[PDB]
Ligand binder design. Structure first.
Ligand SMILES: [Zn+2]
Ligand SMILES: [Zn+2]
Length: 100
DNA sequence: TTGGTCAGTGCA
DNA sequence: TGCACTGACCAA
């Protein structure tokens, strides 16, 4: 369970993500969403939507300073959506197989 | 300012 | 096991 870099397989993406098993899937999903033009992340306190989990972290920090960010793991994401799955499998298909 | 990254981990 | 959340460095 030592940190190893996982190369993103999105076309022309040169980013690798440092990864180990305790981390789980979320930071890989989060990087895959950088390549996504849909807005699958929906705020639970207002109508705002955005592309990545990280952007939603920044949204709660700035716009909902007294709220706890909740339900933004795998279990709370639209993992059965076909467009979502396409982006995931374009980036980290090997690591995001058992996502559902 | 925005937020992509690393690093981290208690508990089911 | 790995989920789903924490704090923080630093590029743009
Ligand atoms: Zn990538
Ligand atoms: Zn909001």
């Amino acid at each position: 369970d030592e940190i190893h870099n996982i190369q993103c397989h999105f076309p022309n993406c040169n980013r690798a993500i440092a990864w180990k098993r305790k981390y789980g899937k979320l930071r890989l999903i989060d990087h895959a969403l950088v390549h996504c033009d849909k807005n699958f992340l929906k705020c639970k306190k207002c109508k705002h939507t955005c592309h990545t989990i990280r952007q939603m972290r920044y949204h709660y920090r700035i716009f909902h300073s007294t709220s706890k960010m909740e339900g933004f793991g795998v279990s709370g994401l639209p993992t059965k959506n076909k467009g979502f799955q396409k982006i995931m499998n374009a980036c980290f298909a090997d690591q995001l197989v058992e996502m559902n």
